[PDB]
Amino acid sequence: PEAFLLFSRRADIRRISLETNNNNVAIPLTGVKEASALDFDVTDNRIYWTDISLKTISRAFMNGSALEHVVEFGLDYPEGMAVDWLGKNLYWADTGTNRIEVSKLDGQHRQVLVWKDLDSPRALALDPAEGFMYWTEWGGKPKIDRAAMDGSERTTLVPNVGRANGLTIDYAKRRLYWTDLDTNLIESSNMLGLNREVIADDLPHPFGLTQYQDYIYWTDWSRRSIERANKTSGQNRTIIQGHLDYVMDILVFHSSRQSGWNECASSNGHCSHLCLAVPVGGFVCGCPAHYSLNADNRTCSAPTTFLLFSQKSAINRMVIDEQQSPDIILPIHSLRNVRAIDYDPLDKQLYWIDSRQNMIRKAQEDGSQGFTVVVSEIQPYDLSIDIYSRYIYWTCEATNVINVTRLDGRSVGVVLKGEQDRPRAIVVNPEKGYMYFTNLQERSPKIERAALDGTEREVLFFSGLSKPIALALDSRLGKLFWADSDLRRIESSDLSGANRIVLEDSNILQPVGLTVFENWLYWIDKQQQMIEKIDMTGREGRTKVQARIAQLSDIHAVKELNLQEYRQHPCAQDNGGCSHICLVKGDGTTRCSCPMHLVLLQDELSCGEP
Amino acid sequence: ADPEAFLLFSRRADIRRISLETNNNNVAIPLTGVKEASALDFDVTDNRIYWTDISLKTISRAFMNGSALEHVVEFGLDYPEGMAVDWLGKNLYWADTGTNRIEVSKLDGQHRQVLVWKDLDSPRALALDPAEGFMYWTEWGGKPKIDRAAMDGSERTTLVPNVGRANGLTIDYAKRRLYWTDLDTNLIESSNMLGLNREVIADDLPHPFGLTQYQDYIYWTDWSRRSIERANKTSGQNRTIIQGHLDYVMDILVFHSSRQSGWNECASSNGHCSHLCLAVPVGGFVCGCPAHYSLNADNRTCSAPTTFLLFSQKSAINRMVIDEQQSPDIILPIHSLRNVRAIDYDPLDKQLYWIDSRQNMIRKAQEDGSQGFTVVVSEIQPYDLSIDIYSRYIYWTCEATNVINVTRLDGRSVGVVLKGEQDRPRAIVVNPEKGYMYFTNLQERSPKIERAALDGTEREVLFFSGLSKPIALALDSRLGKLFWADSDLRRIESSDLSGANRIVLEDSNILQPVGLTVFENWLYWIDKQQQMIEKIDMTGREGRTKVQARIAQLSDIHAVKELNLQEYRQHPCAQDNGGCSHICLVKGDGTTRCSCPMHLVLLQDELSCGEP
Amino acid sequence: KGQEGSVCLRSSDCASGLCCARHFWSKICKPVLKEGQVCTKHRRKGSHGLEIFQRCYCGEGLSCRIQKRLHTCQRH
Ligand SMILES: *[C@@H]1O[C@H](CO[C@@H]2O[C@@H](C)[C@@H](O)[C@@H](O)[C@@H]2O)[C@@H](O[C@@H]2O[C@H](CO)[C@@H](O)[C@H](O)[C@H]2NC(C)=O)[C@H](O)[C@H]1NC(C)=O
Ligand SMILES: *[C@@H]1O[C@H](CO[C@@H]2O[C@@H](C)[C@@H](O)[C@@H](O)[C@@H]2O)[C@@H](O[C@@H]2O[C@H](CO)[C@@H](O)[C@H](O)[C@H]2NC(C)=O)[C@H](O)[C@H]1NC(C)=O
Ligand SMILES: *[C@@H]1O[C@H](CO)[C@@H](O[C@@H]2O[C@H](CO)[C@@H](O)[C@H](O)[C@H]2NC(C)=O)[C@H](O)[C@H]1NC(C)=O
Ligand SMILES: *[C@@H]1O[C@H](CO)[C@@H](O[C@@H]2O[C@H](CO)[C@@H](O)[C@H](O)[C@H]2NC(C)=O)[C@H](O)[C@H]1NC(C)=O
Ligand SMILES: *[C@@H]1O[C@H](CO)[C@@H](O)[C@H](O)[C@H]1NC(C)=O
Ligand SMILES: *[C@@H]1O[C@H](CO)[C@@H](O)[C@H](O)[C@H]1NC(C)=O
Ligand SMILES: *[C@@H]1O[C@H](CO)[C@@H](O)[C@H](O)[C@H]1NC(C)=O
Ligand SMILES: *[C@@H]1O[C@H](CO)[C@@H](O)[C@H](O)[C@H]1NC(C)=O
Ligand SMILES: *[C@@H]1O[C@H](CO)[C@@H](O)[C@H](O)[C@H]1NC(C)=O
Ligand SMILES: *[C@@H]1O[C@H](CO)[C@@H](O)[C@H](O)[C@H]1NC(C)=O
């Protein structure tokens, strides 16, 4: 076919013919605001680009059809990208987020390959045939690193260099070309970062860079152009195009740029998710973020135990791998203002309250299968799931009640509504047929307990309370936890209400969320913008988990569900044959109960009108 | 005033005006010869704009109608990045990141003075508050900050220490606050006039640069979005774009009468100050003087410096005083200067003489730069000069014809007094008090230092050994001492005028001495390569001392002491030139003979010179 | 060789403790940064091309890291 040159400038991507250099035409694209990094896929006849304003990574055919965003979450400054034409994978480097990530060309199965010891990765260049990838870093002390295309064997290829850009690979001649923005020159070396040579140092302001056949192409910020030169000599120079300012990325589009073979190219390595190239031109199977590679070295299994912390416009998942795996933003669309969150370990579904819409919603990890469970005046404050009976307890800030609703939106009814009292924080403990909640009464706040049917009420604590805003509990530890906003402290006691102690009153500003994961107590501080944890074993003391997390709203721990043990709950299957409420005391006693507007009937299963 | 408030901004080759309206007309001020305009201010009462040009290295002004284009400061500038107008005292303030100085002068440029020179690390933006007597500026060093001081340079202190490169420093006078951009954190901040109550007005900005405010809005520029935008000055919201597609907008400002209000004692009869009227927070105002001038006992008038030191470079002649305060040296505004090789000074008429090595002439001018006059022109190639202030003569050496030539101060020749086949006179110093002259004679492969009578007779060799490059001479008539510097031998030596008692003064840590001068009891000298001015105590009581470092292309240095007019007239040649036609020599007994150049002969009058 | 403020073209034209950084629309010799001194950190790649007030890099054994928002030259 033919070989044209691609370049990005502001809100459009264009192509200049290399035979007829004056043929400057645009690529039929829409919606682009600030095109930065640029790549392609000759096979699929597709173009790829990142948008640092729109915070996306998009793709489309050269004819402009099938424009689609492939990555639209957790991006800050995606100034590095590269298409893996063999493994059919998409690589990118974010400077704002300090991560080198990977996924499929269509965006699924995203995973972080590099995140530890990363300072401003800018340019990225792949080599699937050899199983290596290279990138420049600007932060701290500029350098060019290398690593297997799975993130392994990371090493500093070039230690002494200025901020480098336009990292390009001469696949045929096996060399690395780049521009040094600080030293102001074009350099070159071998794959080992040796045999280093300066191609040109008398250029006014080189920025972009690429190479094709015997030539190198660069852009000049000051001469406002795209020029060309003998790739080894640096001479025999001509001007391809002039009057081109603010050119971000430049790249030659031709078949001879994406050649070679890979095991990932044959059958994706028989991998269930990601096929990632490694040294020798071999490969390895990779998984999505937080997923684990099974013993068969080819299949992936999702995380079973993890933490969920929410902020105003995002819900995040974090895990505790020794690998130190970084937290991620769940791809859930239309998040306006989340107040609280919970999770269903049985069907792996995420639930949350949205104060903007005054409703309760739910969706899966991957953000699909969305569904609203409660809509409306109604004004949800906090929620807590009974994973056994299969319904959601939640408190309303407007009507001041505790409403119960099936996971399918089907209403059950009200279980607690008394004048003067105001339910706020709530956690259910179905294992013992109880529920704990804070009661922010007009003049006296207290922490209460009751049966899941709203009966058998009793005040656990009434002193040392001005604004109990968060609750948590752990059966194993036999503890009840709460945090007070006004008193700036976290307290604990036994589920019984005995042995009350202050866990921490120092260095606390605004606690809004508590949860128990493993044997630690995690809490979020909305004002300090932190997530901290204390060891309930008293061996590790107090440490910080994350810093600078804006608009923290809630934090929730998820433990793997023991199905063999879950099924043993009498109120689990068919809801114990109960019409509405099914609960089980600690003395084994199980029984059907009813919401306030109904009554238990003669069959002691069904509920009817009084 | 009634005229609407409009927006002015500098933009490299031109300065333009726009309205507060979005997408409204954008017109360039009809100016000429503007290369790179940066700092920008105005004087509404005079209908004038001032701007700095970092390519021309000047500060200029003109009316809004482009007329009256004049340069107000055109010397001693490197990067005048900051500049502000004191509309009350009618003064011009500016800061220079290259020279590290905050200076002030009258709006027309005269009576320039340095206000801050110590502990300065790249002063950038400058905002004045003549009503309160305070000035504020941003500083861009290793540790950027925003400092404050009295508008006389007194009471300097850091107002906000925890900041990056701040720019567009502007004051909201009505509501007592400071606004600025930050080029390192890309945000627009604000604080009260004390650097406290520090709030962030806008943070989601890609590349903010310029800034200004008027009424309830702030206006800024953005290099990335190529724009001029505005927003709520307290909120930071209600944002709109005023202008788009504007490349490289350097400085911006609001041209309205309400911006330049208030009053002080300086606005009225200039505080009765002879030269400068400088507002201060405590005491209303203080009177100031030009660089190196003293404020007289009356607290109102000034007196020029009496004694000082002159050191020349290749392209400039500088003056520096010897103060306990360590007052900064200044560049003399001589337009005639191009390539100086040697300097001298006539204390009688108070005028500065130098040799231009390229145009090959000896020129003259007062420190003011005015009254310039060429006294020697052409082949002729002047090497060094030494003024006889009594007979009003210049003794100079020619590198071309290898002679010692003597010329009157007005331009007409007296004649040659020394010429020889193998003679090559270079450095020269006259001692008309005793009747002799001293010079270096760079004969081929045997350099030497000689003496002779001011007519060329009684020649003798003082020194012929221990020399390689006798490059500079200096003498002290009072103590009958001679000093010379040798470039090759890297040392400064001394001796009696007779040539006895030859002693090495300094021969360590010297590379390239090229100038000597005696100032009181000290011997000052300049090292071309070390780029330093140093001094030793001739009495040896105190130790070798550095005066100034990092001075490039040093050529000559010269001490000027106040002339004793009475002691001056005691000299037998002071008036009527001793009754002689040409040279007036001084006998050992204070009596005077008359002599002549090489081409004339003394007549029977024993006063006149005729031809054989 | 080039001193601070001197016009330069390449860092090689400058003295030992200096580099060739652009100031406005030409380049002059500027000093390298020392420990504690504020250093440049670009957000967008393009902001590097637009910079007309360029600082020098951090000196030997110094790294441009964030304070514990400015960045200062700190030791590894
Ligand atoms: C835009 O192009 C796509 C894909 O590229 C086309 O086919 C390539 C092999 C190559 O020849 C390119 O020049 C072409 O542009 C087109 O996708 C095709 O769509 C048709 C149905 O419309 C389908 O039958 C084909 O299988 C598709 N091709 C492939 C390779 O899958 C698409 O039609 C073009 N869009 C428009 C609006 O014309
Ligand atoms: C350009 O303007 C100057 C000065 O501005 C004038 O006075 C200001 C206070 C203000 O009122 C402006 O609108 C005026 O234009 C003009 O200089 C003046 O000229 C007049 C008439 O010749 C003379 O009487 C004044 O003394 C001058 N100076 C001042 C300070 O008023 C000048 O004429 C204008 N040039 C052109 C070409 O129009
Ligand atoms: C508890 O939740 C249920 C729904 O989950 C609410 O029931 C709704 O009541 C309104 C009347 O106010 C009806 O119009 C809706 O059709 C009902 N929804 C469903 C799904 O039945 C109920 O209002 C909530 N709280 C209270 C106080 O009952
Ligand atoms: C010495 O100085 C005088 C000027 O001070 C020079 O005299 C000039 O001589 C030329 C002839 O060569 C005349 O045409 C000029 O008119 C003279 N100038 C003046 C102002 O008188 C003289 O050339 C210098 N050198 C010598 C060797 O005499
Ligand atoms: C490129 O440079 C090399 C070395 O100077 C030279 O041998 C070769 O001919 C050049 N190639 C072209 C296509 O000009
Ligand atoms: C490129 O330039 C070199 C040096 O001027 C010359 O020798 C060579 O022949 C040129 N090559 C081409 C292909 O023009
Ligand atoms: C999985 O990888 C490990 C590590 O190389 C290897 O020891 C093991 O044999 C592999 N398992 C299978 C089923 O191939
Ligand atoms: C700016 O904000 C303040 C309060 O934040 C508000 O009172 C004012 O109306 C806003 N805008 C204007 C035009 O004053
Ligand atoms: C500015 O925006 C606020 C809301 O963001 C609005 O209430 C106000 O009316 C706007 N303008 C003024 C002049 O206050
Ligand atoms: C000059 O200033 C001093 C100190 O303020 C003062 O004592 C003296 O009276 C002043 N001389 C005048 C005003 O003539």
- In whole angstroms, what is the distance from residue A83 CA to residue B400 CA? 74
Q: Are B449 and B468 in contact (CB under 8 A)?
A: no
Q: What angle do CA B533, B535, B537 make, to 5 degrees?
A: 175
CA–CA gap between residue B228 and residue B544 (Å, rounded):
57
Q: What is the largest CA-CA distance in chain A?
A: 98
Start-end of H helices in B420-536 = none
Instruction: Write out chain A residues lying below 8 Å of C64, CB-based.
Output: 139-141
First to last CA, chain B: 83
Give dist(CA B593, CA A476) in Å, integer. 122
Task: Select from A495, A100, A514 the least CA-distant residue to A307.
Answer: A514
Asked whether residue B305 falls in the same domain as residue B235, the answer is no
Q: In whole angstroms, how far apart are CA B344 and each of B196, B378, B386?
A: 54, 20, 7
Residue A518 and residue A530 in contact, taking contact as beta carbons nearer than 8 Å = no
CB distance B234 to B217 below 8 Å: no
Closest by CA position to A335, among listed A357, A317, A318: A357
Contact with chain C for residue B517, Cβ under 8 A: no
User: Which single residue is written with the structure tokens 């070679």?
Assistant: A260
**How is residue A514 written in tokens?**
């508590």
Dihedral sign for Cα atoms in the order A40, A43, A45, A51: negative
Report how far residue B155's alpha carbon sits from residue B177's, in angstroms, rounded to the nearest whole number. Answer: 20
Q: What are phi and psi of A139, to 5 degrees?
A: -75, 150
Q: Is the CB of A411 under 6 A from ligand 3?
A: yes
In this complex, the chains that touch A, judged by 3 or more CB pairs closer than 8 A, are C
Q: What is the DSSP letter of A255?
A: G
Q: Exposure pattern of A99-123 as b/e (b: 16+ CB <10 Å)?
A: bbbbbbbebebbbbbbbeebbbbbb
Q: What is the DSSP letter of A280?
A: G
Please give the torsion angle defined by the CA atoms of residues A442, A447, A448 and A454, in that order, rounded to the nearest 10 degrees: 60
Sign of the four-CA dihedral B453, B455, B458, B459? positive
Q: Report the DSSP beta bridge partners of residue B88.
A: none
- Per-residue b/e over B47-80, b at no fewer than 16 CB within 10 Å? ebbbbbbbebbbbbbbeeeeeeeeebbebbbbbb
Q: What whole-number distance in Å separates Cα of residue B556 and Cα of residue B485?
A: 12
Q: Cβ contacts of residue A65 below 8 Å, gap of 6+?
A: none
- Give the 3-state secondary structure percentages of chain C, helix then strand then coil, rounded to 5: 10, 40, 50
The residues, ordered by sequence, that sit 6+ positions from B161 with a Cβ below 8 Å of its Cβ are: B143, B145
Burial class, B34, CB count within 10 angstroms (exposed 0-12 / middle 13-18 / buried 19+): buried
Reduce the DSSP state of residue A40 to 3 states and report it. Answer: strand
Say whether both A280 and A330 belong to one domain: no
With an 8 Å Cβ cutoff, are C49 and A207 in contact? yes
Distance CA A38, CA A8 (A): 7
DSSP class of residue B562 equals: P
Task: Tell me how far apart the alpha carbons of residues B38 and B55 are, in angstroms, rounded to a whole number.
Answer: 9
Tell if the CB–CB gap between C45 and A139 is shorter than 8 Å. no
Beta carbons of B595 and B453 less than 8 angstroms apart: yes
Whether the Cβ atoms of residue A358 and residue A376 lie closer than 8 Å to each other: yes
User: Residue with structure tokens 């809509």?
Assistant: A375
Alpha-carbon distances of A309 from A364, A424, A489, A597, rounded to whole Å: 15, 19, 20, 36
Distance CA B278, CA B270 (A): 9
Nearest listed ligand to the Cα of residue B300: 10
Same domain for B303 and B278? no
Residue B288 one-letter amino acid: G
CA gap A212, A229 in Å, rounded = 10
Helix (H, G, I), strand (E, B) or coil at B500: coil
Query: What does the block give as tokens for B580?
Result: 């002689």
d(CA A531, CA A552): 9
Angstrom distance (rounded) from CA B588 to CA B565: 22
Residues B493 and B385 in one domain: yes
**How many structural domains are present in chain A?**
2
Which residues on neighbouring strands pair with residue B522, listed in sequence order?
Answer: B519, B537
Looking at the fold, whether A185 and A297 belong to one and the same domain comes out as no
Among the bound ligands, the one closest to the CA of B400? 4
Q: Which residue has the tokens 């001193």?
A: C3
**Gap between the Cα atoms of B337 and B359, Å rounded:** 10
- Number of Cβ atoms within 10 Å of the Cβ of B410: 9
Angle in degrees, CA C10, A233, A212, rounded to 5? 110
**Shared domain check, B204 and B149:** yes
Residue A565 parent element (H or E): helix A563-566
Say yes or no: A212 and A300 in one domain.
no
- Which of B23, B21, B16 is CA-nearest to residue B37? B16
* Residue ranges around ligand 7 (CB below 6 Å): A 296-297
Parent domain of A326: 290-610
Do A334 and A190 sit in the same domain of this protein?
no
Give the closest-approach CA distance of C19 to chain B in angstroms: 15
DSSP string spanning A144-167? EEEEETTS-S-EEEESS--SEEEE
Coil vs helix vs strand at A269: helix
Nearest beta carbon to residue B143 from set C25, C38, C50: C38
- Homologous superfamily of domain range C1-76: Lipase, subunit A (2.10.80.10)
Helices (H) and strands (E) in chain B, counts: 1, 56
What is the Å distance from ligand 10's center to B298 Cα?
A: 6
From B236, B257, B291, give the residue that closes a domain. Answer: B291
**B273 CA distance to ligand 10 middle (Å):** 13
Residue A578: both structure tokens together: 């109960």
**Residues A210, A94 within the same domain:** yes
CA B91 to the chain's CA centroid: 19
CA–CA separation, B334 vs B369, rounded Å?
A: 4
The span from the CA of A567 to the CA of A388, in Å, is 9
CB count, 10 Å around CB of B419? 17
Encoded amino acid at A11, one letter: A
Chain B nearest-CA distance from C14, in A, is 14
Report which DSSP code applies to A544: E
Query: Residues A199, A186: contact at Cβ < 8 Å?
Result: yes
Strand B276-280 relative to strand B82-86: parallel, antiparallel, unpaired? unpaired
Among residues B202, B204, B209, B203, which one has the least CA distance to residue B226?
Answer: B209
Give dist(CA B94, CA B75) in Å, integer.
Answer: 13
HEC letters along B133-165: CEEEEEECCCCCEEEEEECCCCCCEEEECCCCC
The first and second tokens of residue B531, run together, are 């780029």
Q: What is the DSSP string of A433-486?
A: TEEEEEEE-SS-EEEEEEETTS-S-EEEE-SS-S-EEEEEEETTTTEEEEEETT
Determine the residue of chain A that is closest to C48 in CA distance: A181
Among B264, B291, B318, the domain boundary falls at B291
Question: Which of B291, B318, B337 is a domain's end point?
Answer: B291
The nearest alpha carbon in chain C to A201 belongs to C10
Residues A351, A341: Cα–Cα separation, whole Å: 6
Query: How far is residue B220's CA from residue B243's CA, in Å, rounded to a whole number?
Result: 11
For the domain that residue B557 is a member of, what is the CATH number? 2.120.10.30
- The residue among B469, B475, B472 whose CA lies nearest residue B443 is B469
The secondary structure of B1-35 as a DSSP string is --SPPEEEEEEBTEEEEE-SSTT--EEE---SS--
Rounded CA-CA distance B408/B390 in Å is: 11
Q: Look at residue A299 and give its three-state secondary structure.
A: coil
Between CA B10 and CA B168 the distance in angstroms is 12
Q: How many Å apart are CA A82 and CA A258, to the nearest integer?
A: 11
Cα→Cα distances A159→A141, A142, A146, A162, A164, Å:
8, 7, 11, 9, 12
Beta bridge partners of A293: A300
Same structural domain, A135 and A189: yes
DSSP readout, B61-128? EEETTS-S-EEEE-SS-S---EEEEETTTTEEEEEETTTTEEEEEETTS-S-EEEE-TT---EEEEEE
- SS3 assignment, position B55: coil
| A270: three-class secondary structure by DSSP | helix
- Are the C-beta atoms of B349 and B362 separated by less than 8 Å? no
Q: Write down the residue that tokens 């005691």 correspond to.
A: B570
**What separation in Å is there between the alpha carbon of B301 and the centre of ligand 10?**
12
Contacts 24+ apart (CB under 8 A), B393-399: B394/B344, B394/B353, B394/B362, B395/B428, B395/B430, B395/B437, B395/B454, B396/B355, B396/B362, B396/B428, B397/B425, B397/B426, B397/B427, B397/B428, B397/B439, B399/B426
Break-preceding residues in chain C (C–N over 2.5 Å): 68
Tokens of A302: 């999702």
Q: Which of B270, B299, B325, B329 is nearest to B153 (CA)?
A: B325
Whether B604 is in the pocket of ligand 2, judged by its Cβ within 6 Å, is no
The first and second tokens of residue A550, run together, are 């804006």
DSSP letter, residue A265:
H
User: Residue B449 corresponds to which tokens in the numbers above?
Assistant: 């230092």
Distance from CA of B577 to the nearest CA of C (A): 50
Pairing of strands B276-280, B252-255: unpaired
Domain residue ranges in chain C: 1-76
User: Does any CB of chain C come closer than 8 Å to the CB of residue B272?
Assistant: no
List of E strands, B205-251: 208-214, 217-222, 227-232, 240-244
Atom 11 in ligand 8: residue holding the nearest Cα: B232
Whether residues A405 and A508 fall in one domain:
yes
Q: Exposure string (b/e) for B456-468, b if CB count within 10 Å is 16 or more?
A: beeeeebbeeebe
Neighbouring residues of B536: CB distance < 8 A, sequence distance ≥ 6 = B492, B505, B506, B522, B523, B543, B544, B545
Kindly list the partner chains of chain B, i.e. chains with 3 or more CB atom pairs below 8 Å. C
The token pair at B71 is 């340069």
Alpha carbon distance A532, A540 (integer Å): 13
Task: Clarify whether residues A295 and A284 are in a common domain.
Answer: no
CA dist., res. B67 & res. B48, Å (int)? 10
SS3 A432: helix
Q: Are A378 and A358 in contact (CB under 8 A)?
A: yes
Q: Please report where in the chains the tokens 């400088």 appear, as a residue.
A: B278
User: How many Cα atoms occupy the beta-carbon half-sphere of A582 within 13 Å?
Assistant: 21
- Measured at the alpha carbon of residue B389, what is the angle toward residues B388 and B393, in degrees to the nearest 5? 50
A135 contacts A313 by C-beta, under 8 angstroms: no
Nearest residue on chain C to B186, judged by CA atoms?
C43
**Chains in contact with C via at least 3 Cβ–Cβ pairs below 8 Å:** A, B
